[PDB]
């Protein structure tokens, strides 16, 4: 019954085409509730969930201010990291940042995160103790030394333990009808002669699911879980069989693991 709140930031430099493109997206479990886009006209943080729209305008002012501050920080860090790696000004580079907190069923803090990336590879991450940093290369050791000399991990730990957890509790209470739901999969099996058997799992929330194929009780194509577009998720698994097979589905909403056989 644990819950999480995550924030994802992407900043891509566009040399010769203006300022870097900045995207900020907030998540509670698998549901997105806020979004900021630098290319949008409003230039404000915007709701993406119905339960977050009940917040006052001062909340959105504060969110817009903080997200624009983060955008400026990433904009400066793009040039700093271009200097670190001896990269030219012609190419485009990406900085990705993710942070958040984990909460339990009791509402108590479990885990805090902050991971940064440069060009799709790890750059620097906070350790599980929320006190030390892990650097991936020599350019990241400069950042690690700067952040240790600035005691940045202390402020980050304060945010992760205190502010993130309380606001996650508030969001979970505001969206208790949606965030605390668990939809069992709508499960069915299909047969197509080549032959193959496809085990469908549709309309389940959250996105964590396990589909396993067993031949007489022994484990053996599997597509990744994909969004249905309406707050639910879909997945299927396939097995090629000659002209005795069972598919097993495990989900939070399902009381017991299903055991599906053809026909």
């Amino acid at each position: 019954g644990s819950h999480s709140m995550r924030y994802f930031f992407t900043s891509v430099s566009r040399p010769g085409r203006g300022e870097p493109r900045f995207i900020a997206v907030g998540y509670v479990d698998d549901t997105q509730f806020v979004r900021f886009d630098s290319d949008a006209a409003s230039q404000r943080m915007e709701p993406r969930a119905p339960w977050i729209e009940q917040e006052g305008p001062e909340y959105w002012d504060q969110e817009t201010r903080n997200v624009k501050a983060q955008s400026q920080t990433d904009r400066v860090d793009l040039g700093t990291l271009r200097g670190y790696y001896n990269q030219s000004e012609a190419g485009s580079h990406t900085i990705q940042i993710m942070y958040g907190c984990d909460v339990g069923s009791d509402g108590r803090f479990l885990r805090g995160y902050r991971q940064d990336a440069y060009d799709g590879k790890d750059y620097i991450a906070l350790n599980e103790d929320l006190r030390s940093w892990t650097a991936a290369d020599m350019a990241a050791q400069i950042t690690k030394r700067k952040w240790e000399a600035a005691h940045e991990a202390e402020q980050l730990r304060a945010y992760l333990d205190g502010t993130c957890v309380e606001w996650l509790r508030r969001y979970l209470e505001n969206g208790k009808e949606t965030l605390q739901r668990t939809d069992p999969p709508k499960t069915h099996m299909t047969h197509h002669p080549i032959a193959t058997l496809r085990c469908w799992a549709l309309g389940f929330y959250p996105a964590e699911i396990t589909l396993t194929w067993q031949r007489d009780g022994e484990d053996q194509e599997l597509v990744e879980t994909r969004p249905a577009g309406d707050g639910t998720f879909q997945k299927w698994a396939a097995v090629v069989v000659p002209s005795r097979y069972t598919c097993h589905v495990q989900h939070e909403g399902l009381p017991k693991p299903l055991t599906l056989r053809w026909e």
Epitope: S42, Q43, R44, P57, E58, D61, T64, R65, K68, A69
Partner: antibody
């Protein structure tokens, strides 16, 4: 009626300290961040300090950095400005302001005069 | 630090004329964080426009705000005798910054 009331202003010797207060009424003072704005006679408005609704974030103008302290106590609905090492340049009318927002809520005080001279 | 440059410094106009006021920001701002104020020579400033285009409660229709990014404008289509005052543009994205103030006076 949404109202802001200033007190604690007056004449102060150069180099001494002084504290200003804002009493808030008619609105949920604890929900919003508050500003201090000063205006020297015959001059424009100059933002001094801001405190967030919970008091975690405090920012100051470069002219008053390290000398002015801003604080709130949400129980009595009061905003505080503590001014130390006051110079003659600090002579102005000081306003506590509930404003600077996108939804159009703007509440000013009546203004308290601080005069710094020998 | 965001610097708000307000131009011109003085508007010498006759009542019944059009007043155009300009504000320059040192960096691009979200339009929702720009406001205009009016101050009479003896009292606190009064908000006229918020969000760079939205009139406050009980503000006459002659006051109108426009602009985006770094350029913003305040227009008074018809100058009433009570409109002759000092006007300030203000940003609230990062702390608060007021413009120098444009004084509207009688020609």
């Amino acid at each position: 009626e949404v109202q802001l009331l200033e007190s604690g202003g007056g004449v102060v010797q150069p180099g001494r300290s002084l504290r200003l207060s804002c009493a808030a009424s008619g609105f949920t003072f604890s929900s919003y961040g508050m500003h201090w704005v000063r205006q020297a006679p015959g001059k424009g408005l100059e933002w001094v300090a801001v405190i967030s609704y919970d008091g975690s974030n405090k920012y100051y103008a470069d002219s008053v950095k390290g000398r002015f302290t801003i604080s709130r106590d949400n129980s009595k609905n009061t905003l505080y400005l503590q001014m130390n090492s006051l110079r003659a340049e600090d002579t102005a009318v000081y306003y506590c302001l509930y404003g600077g927002n996108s939804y159009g809520m703007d509440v000013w005080g009546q203004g308290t005069m601080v005069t710094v001279f020998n | 630090d965001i610097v708000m440059t307000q131009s011109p410094a003085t508007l010498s106009l006759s009542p019944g004329e059009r007043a155009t006021l300009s504000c320059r920001a040192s960096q691009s701002l979200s339009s929702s964080f720009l406001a205009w104020y009016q101050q009479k020579p003896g009292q606190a400033p009064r908000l006229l426009i918020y969000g760079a285009s939205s009139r406050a409660t009980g503000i006459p229709d002659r006051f109108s705000g426009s602009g985006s990014g770094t350029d913003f404008t305040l227009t008074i289509s018809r100058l009433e005798p009570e409109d002759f005052a000092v006007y300030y543009c203000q940003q609230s994205e990062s702390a608060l910054t007021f413009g120098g103030g444009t004084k509207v006076e009688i020609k």
